[PDB]
Design a protein around this ligand. Structure first.
Ligand code: ACO
Ligand code: ACO
Lengths: 351, 354
């Protein structure tokens, strides 16, 4: 079960960006393969012309062969150039069909000449790519990490986590919405639940509330804001902690709850509203993930998805939230190769 | 244990209104008690001067061994000192020494109790629980105190039906005020707050006020009732063109709350009513999921929803019914109680000094 063509690559075609993973063999005996390798290098330098280099996995064994696994991203605008480069450099894999995942794949097959697309499922690719990368480690170092002292986001530090045996695992996938997968083995996983309150809710609400024009700007606003200007805290109701039920005064009682008062709405800043939106969304995800972890009886919770790809702020709030709801019993886990699991899953589905 | 005082009443003192329950005994042998019953009627008529509550009156129930009627009234906090003075002038022994009340406004009221009454503050959630469990135990004049919505998956068509909740335990109580507390009730004297969510009624009103400029909870609900959430939300069909077959999601399910609002074109055409509806759907869908997950983790299959989020339009109740039905795949029915609003006051009555 080794792919038919060469070179071996996997692609995840987004609306804006393609994530591509490709394998560079290192035991080369033929003139043709040596020029394939050189062509891949030249193609890579061109497509990434305007971090991923540092993701390269060196000397791994894939389908019985030694090589380096590379990870690149480029605009979907230039995917025709990638395909043509492949045809001109006589790549057997860019002739017969194209096997890709991602939200832009079907669209791309319509935009694009002669090409037949074999479309792969993003969640199936995600799980396969995630398990494989975890199985090979990150050049002998930790693929997985968490934030120590998660209850203090201004002070938490990144620490390696051993996920050498990944099973069972809960995967919390945060895109526009949130899907939660329980993974029991390579061949046994399902979407156990989800929430429609995801990164699209964060960005949607920020756009409406603040007039921001991108995920990047919304997160920058949030990074500068104070959510407690919008949120009603337990101390706002009780004058301190809610003793009887042991809710601390600093817990959020009602997200956006102070915005019911005309005077509070008049003085709240755009940045406070952006932060309150983010905090509402990340605290809520940490609650759903914790309850799923309890019900599924799984104590390893990994977070992936495009929501995490810009600021480390999203991740730190998720770490804080999971620690809060679990009373310190669960650590939010994150993965270095996040963003490339679909591409890697697509590569592994080549055969 | 029976309360020491006569007459028996309980109050929940809010920031603007007081909710009072009082017991009118049926079997009177002493003239002073007859005069007490006549006083309460006159007091009730005064305070409610200037019909839903009358219809709530529970007739011929048994409280602390005595047959009687339990009355429910609401009146401005502005007139609470009058009520206290009325009781003191009519010689009520329950207004002689100490007044035990619940409600966020009880402490503000403290100085008026000009006078020699100590305020003993009771906890609102403890009162809610004691009140709720007692009212379920007696019924609504035979009629059902508890109801659900049949065909909950179709909020346009769902029908309010009686639900027999005779043996309450165990019960999950989802209390929706500004935020959400969830209590697992195992028996009358063993319950705990098992979790909560900060996305409650205050989130709905707060976001609505920001998004649409509505001025009140009543107005936000009115707007939401006319709106279409699917104008703001991104559905599974918007992502896949239809169902997402492989992972058990129908095309009509919400993929991303407010998710279409990332598009300028969509933001410019969405109505205030649609934004109000999407806010409400987002909150009710999320509470449904939390409630369902709690039910399964606590192994409880009766989930009751209470709190001020429910008191203004039937819409929020039907949407919660809808959400719980969705997440439980029809295995849980959302339950509601007719005397919601007064459980605090009833729990305070039950907490009279004995
Ligand atoms: C009654 C009620 O409705 S309560 C609400 C119940 N609803 C739910 O439980 C649904 C919650 N939501 C979800 O599970 C998710 O939103 C899903 C699964 C429906 C969609 O997944 P999302 O992560 O939101 O998709 P989003 O459009 O942000 O895209 C994220 C990734 O998927 C890929 N993708 C998007 N669409 C497709 C597609 N049609 N085919 C293949 N891949 C796709 C993207 O390219 C992107 O990939 P990347 O992370 O590798 O860059
Ligand atoms: C990291 C994170 O923070 S994740 C977030 C975690 N947060 C949580 O779990 C908390 C979520 N929130 C909650 O549980 C609730 O909001 C609480 C319990 C804190 C407050 O309860 P709410 O229902 O929101 O209070 P709200 O002010 O809306 O009042 C509701 C009722 O309680 C009563 N009440 C309010 N304050 C008080 C008070 N101080 N004393 C007595 N009664 C009170 C009101 O009078 C009102 O009475 P009614 O039901 O008869 O009308």
């Amino acid at each position: 079960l080794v792919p038919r063509g060469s070179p071996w690559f996997g692609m995840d075609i987004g609306g804006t960006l393609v994530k591509l993973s490709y394998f560079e063999p290192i035991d080369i005996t033929a003139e043709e393969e040596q020029e394939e390798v050189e062509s891949l290098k030249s193609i890579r330098k061109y497509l990434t012309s305007n971090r991923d280099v540092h993701l390269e996995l060196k000397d791994l064994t894939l389908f019985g062969r030694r090589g380096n696994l590379h990870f690149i991203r480029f605009p979907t605008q230039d995917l025709p150039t990638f395909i043509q480069m492949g045809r001109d450099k006589n790549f057997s894999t860019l002739q017969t069909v194209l096997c890709a995942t991602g939200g832009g794949a079907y669209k791309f097959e319509k935009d694009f000449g002669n090409l037949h697309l074999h479309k792969l499922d993003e969640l199936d690719c995600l799980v396969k790519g995630l398990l494989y990368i975890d199985s090979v480690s990150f050049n002998g170092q930790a693929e997985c990490y968490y934030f120590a002292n998660a209850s203090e986001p201004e002070r938490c530090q990144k620490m390696p986590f051993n996920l050498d045996d990944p099973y069972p695992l809960l995967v919390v996938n945060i895109g526009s919405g949130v899907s939660i997968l329980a993974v029991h083995s390579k061949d046994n996983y399902k979407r156990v639940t989800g929430t429609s309150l995801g990164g699209g809710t964060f960005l949607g609400l920020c756009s409406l509330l603040t007039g921001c024009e991108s995920f990047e700007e919304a997160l920058e606003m949030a990074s500068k804001g104070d959510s407690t200007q919008a949120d009603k805290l337990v101390r706002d109701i009780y004058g301190g902690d809610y003793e009887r039920f042991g809710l601390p005064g600093w817990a959020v009682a009602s997200s956006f709850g102070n915005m019911i008062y005309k005077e509070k709405r008049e003085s709240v800043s755009k940045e406070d509203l952006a932060r309150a939106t983010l905090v509402t969304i990340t605290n809520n995800i940490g609650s759903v993930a914790r309850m799923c972890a309890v019900n599924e009886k799984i104590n390893r919770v990994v977070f992936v998805g495009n929501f995490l790809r810009v600021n480390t702020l999203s991740m730190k709030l998720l770490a804080y939230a999971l620690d809060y709801w679990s009373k310190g019993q669960l650590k939010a886990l994150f993965l270095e190769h996040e963003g490339y699991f679909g591409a890697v899953g697509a590569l592994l589905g080549l055969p």
